[PDB]
Symmetry: D2
Subunit: 388 residues, 4 copies
């Protein structure tokens, strides 16, 4: 049999025909439309908002959302393959899609009323409306953002920390405390961009994820009508369902960025010489290439198996911790190995590696989680918590 | 709704066919019931009970991939893997004995032997009535000095092989030697039988690891081999390499069994032992280590399962074995070291045995990361061995 | 301007002439008298008590103890050099000396009465009496207890994993005394109620004998309590001294592993050239050389600071953690470079114990973390 | 009675002479007073204030080892090291500017120059009145070539990634010269009046953004006879300069590592998780212990090497040990620190991200490959593994 160095376990042959078609559609879009934009977008710290309508047209937004609500009605393995192809170009583009799909469409679909689903989901699916998600606050290190009941609805006050998409978003899913019969309960609210008490100031000066627009959400007596509270969830289950979905996409995405770094490093050491032979002739270099290949190959079997289990309903949430932690950690290690194999300083095409690297350094710590995921798995094995 | 299985997070159990589960359970029953009670004393005093071969043969654990026509159980590669894992879960020495019988003796006779050789040797090897060994390694493949000379009616062999598992109890010896034919010096395989004049197999005592398996030399001083005992259908490196590729697949599964044992022992130990009035398991540094053990085993097992499936389908290139052997052996040794460093006594210390075993397994073939270089050459087209 | 691969920073030039001779004396002894013993001693788990008298006659026991009490009146740098030369042969032998010098002679010298010092120290210094240190118990605050009786104290309890105990003549035992504080007691073998059964079948440190101390109403006369210490300061002073010797010793074992690996890869061939021609092997050799070289600068400096009185106890945590950790890493790298199944294996199993001897948790990391942050993370 | 100094456990301070402590304090006062306020903007916008050379020169930080006879401060290798560490504590870009001036320009003119050249160039380089650069590396043996002409030499070729070149007054360029039957590497001093010399800046760097870098393009650049270095030929010339520079980088990288450690430590004391400081976590304390350990041991290594260089007992291989160790451990520390901060570039603590990309370049300036490991391997085994 013939060896495929770039796909040793023939992942391509473990996919169904429809899945290969989705992967190929996502690849064609990412390489055709995102790859040409990324170098300038990252340099200037901007993003073309047109990307949402482009992705929506191809059916890449809300991959698991049924066709009834304008989604493409795909499964978790297809979601993963899409994330991998987008992040192969840039993690910032993957982040924008993660927010739209897992953090906005998912909670409206899972927890919203029929009216909310019919209004918001078709617009989010086409990318006509851009979404963002407001959860984390400075004091979380539970939450300060508060919905006060007023005639006709709720009045929200508080602020959420750097939210991807917020300065260009049309739709905001915000989690806030609501007094219910004397007790505070976490509830989700849908806000629209024109809300008087809502501001979404942009944040610039980022080191990583510069191709994605990021901002805050600031609420000062932001009125939300009664019909825009998510009726079918309360407590942490709401935001946690979203985060779980998003972390699955990140686990696949990180492997795409790792693959890009590996391919760049391999091509570089083939092209560059030292002492009259390619750098690839050195055992030390070959050892690094072997490690990159091994970890990506194993990582991919992991996320594929997880996707298959999620589609069957046999996947417990702890497995997401295994795979998110493994993909993000090993991807960062690979980007570092690749970076250390390059000479020069940022002018050449190979220094797309430096971009992947700073992106992965943010992604790995965007919640601050390689260590937290370890402790989730520790507790699951031992029945003893070591968080605090 | 879904339950988490900490000991099998990706539900490997559910990825197996019913008949594969049955093979695994039979191997587990045998290893736990018959090898586990022996291992502690066998390792301590460096004794091997040759009866083990007959026990394994009776239940069809020797030469798992060898067809029923020749006395084998006619299983596939995934089954071979599952068996190796269950045996090595007890001890790598026992797995090594099996590996040698199956991949280093039965495989080359099956692949490269004449009809007569297959009919004679394989059924007795399959039952364990005859015990086999594999003579490639010499004291300090292409570098070998063991030599065959053509004589009337056969060959005369002279030379020495070192660190040969099973040799002091072997009935059948597969020996690789150089034969100069047409001025061209090439490797050929020869089948020798115990009692051959000029063949001796003195034992090596005082091993650090793999003490549950008996190992020795093969010393050949003008050992006569009749013409009908040369393997007719192979010349050169393909011969020994085919055997080693088969054995490496089993070791990739086996090492993960030893790793699982170390993980499970470490986990139980840190639940039981206390420091500062809390179980050791309450320490973040300990939980991080347990997370890493779980992760590497879980992913390693997906790798070897997929490789086994590809081998059974005929879609696996030889380079894939390098990925998995390198990963399984390296990660297993890392896990055994992490487990060892979590223990605080001085001889639970099943871990110490697994650790010294894995140190030998990782070093058995080479001192140099040769699998990395196989993979680097496969990616770049450039050779970095010499 | 010549490079010395085996001593790149010329440690030999940073030592004074007396320190160089202490080192050379310990080396001559270790290589002449311990090296021929070690292979069989480790394999069969036998101890020869005469080793203590050999060491004592040379002046290697209690290096920091003054001449007035039988010591050679040396300093911490000298102690370190000795430990390093002994452990270059075997950690088990170093462990025997660590106990004698730091765990037995030190507390009697620092905390004992004049009578205790005059009686015990000269005999410990010559190795004619063998000491052991009873701190560790099965209960991970201690339960060994002294009760005041007419004429002295009655001691009851149990200590575990005590190096030298089955062959010891002198026992420094720490126990709680109700006034409730930890006190130190000197007992002798032959004291009614004291036993010291051996522990057999060890994985590492097999060249050293280890056991328990069992006390069942053992009478200790008033003149055998250490009068000048109470509380944790007693045992902690001893442990701090021992940890310094171990930091040096571990570097000796590491050096042996490095030198064995280097010679091996020069001797063995692959594809018609030494294994040493491979880049992967050279990187490993470079890493071994680097870590040992920097490790030795660290312990040397700490030794000079201890001798000047400028070293805080936390510095010992840095060096102990570093030396033991890096030594084990080097032993493992060296082990993985060898081919066969036969001294690196011994050093490796020894260093695995030495690393875990105090505990499984990275207590020294936590000591340093607390010292940087002001926040406790032990429990 | 001994107190523990967590930030200096082995009391490096007490291992220095009084004059060495004064040099260190002077460098620290300058770097903290004049470089720290510039660095954030300088790195963000990729700008370099050339006034820095004059500031450093007037307090005597340029060419530390150069004798007083030639305008240098007449200090020793330990002092050079201490200065580098104080500058790089602020930024590697600033240390790189100084490394070039001191080790790559003043050192070759001092070691290999005529008395006329030493008298002309060194006093001006020492004050920062003239800024130097060093042209060895080519865009890719050496292709830049000098041809004998009446009155001197005509140089053609190109050098790439040359720190200081777009602001330089003095250019030390290594070129092949075919002369009297042998083709040899020679060193040439070029200046601003040279019509065939240009030095366009390179912008868009990932790391070392606070230091200006350019090319040296030579198109029949005339260099008079009096401007060739007379007392060196072959690789000895540039290698002497690099060996000197590497010593300063070994000290410098420890300064950058110290900054990353101090930032991380302060962050984990200030930031909370589950109601307690991040510093309360065992996982975090382990990382802090590792940072402290490697910096402490690293500093003992570079101090000893400095003492040996000053005594004349240091072989060049020792520089490989320390360069490799300082750069490698510093980069590991910056990555540990980065991974502890998380977030994205906005806060003052993301000075760590700046040190990190700087150290990634400093390690890459060495090569694609662990060449210092192979220098050390050959020195232990007598076997070459470079080819
Ligand atoms: Mg393909
Ligand atoms: Mg507004
Ligand atoms: Mg089960
Ligand atoms: Mg100017």
């Amino acid at each position: 049999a013939t060896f495929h160095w770039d796909d040793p376990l023939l992942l391509d042959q473990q996919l169904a025909d429809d899945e290969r078609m989705v992967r190929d559609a996502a690849h064609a879009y990412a390489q055709g439309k995102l790859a040409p934009r990324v170098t300038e977008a990252f340099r200037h710290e901007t993003t073309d908002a047109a990307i949402f309508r482009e992705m929506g047209e191809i059916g890449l937004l809300g991959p698991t959302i049924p066709e009834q609500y304008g989604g493409p009605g795909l499964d978790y393995v297809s979601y993963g393959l899409i994330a991998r192809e987008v992040e192969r170009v840039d993690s910032g583009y993957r982040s924008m899609m993660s927010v739209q799909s897992s953090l906005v469409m998912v909670p409206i679909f899972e927890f919203g009323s029929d009216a909310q689903k019919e209004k918001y989901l078709p617009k989010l699916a086409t990318g006509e409306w851009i979404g963002c998600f407001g959860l984390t606050e400075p004091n979380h290190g539970s939450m300060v953002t508060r919905a006060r009941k007023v005639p006709g609805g709720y009045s929200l006050s508080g602020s959420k920390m750097w939210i991807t998409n917020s300065p260009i978003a049309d739709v905001f899913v915000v989690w806030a405390k609501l007094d219910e019969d004397g007790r505070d309960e976490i509830r989700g609210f849908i806000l629209e961009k024109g809300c008087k008490g809502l501001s979404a100031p942009a944040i610039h000066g980022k080191v990583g994820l510069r191709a994605s627009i990021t901002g805050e959400i600031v609420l000062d007596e932001a009125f939300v009508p009664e019909e825009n509270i998510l009726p079918h969830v309360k407590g942490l289950r709401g935001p946690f369902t979203c985060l779980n979905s998003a972390r699955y996409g990140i686990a696949w995405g990180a492997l795409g960025a790792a693959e890009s770094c590996w391919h760049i490093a391999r091509q570089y050491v083939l092209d560059r010489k030292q002492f009259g032979r390619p750098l690839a002739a050195n055992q030390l270099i070959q050892k690094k290439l072997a490690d990159m290949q091994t970890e990506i190959t194993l990582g991919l079997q992991g996320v594929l198996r997880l996707g298959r289990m999620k589609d069957e309903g046999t996947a417990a949430v702890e497995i997401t911790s295994i795979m998110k932690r493994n993909s993000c950690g090993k991807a960062l290690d690979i980007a570092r190995l690749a970076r250390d194999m390059l000479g020069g300083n940022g002018i050449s095409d190979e220094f797309g590696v430096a971009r992947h690297l700073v992106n992965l350094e943010v992604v790995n710590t965007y919640e601050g989680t390689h260590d937290i995921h370890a402790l989730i798995l520790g507790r699951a094995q031992t029945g003893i918590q070591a968080f605090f």
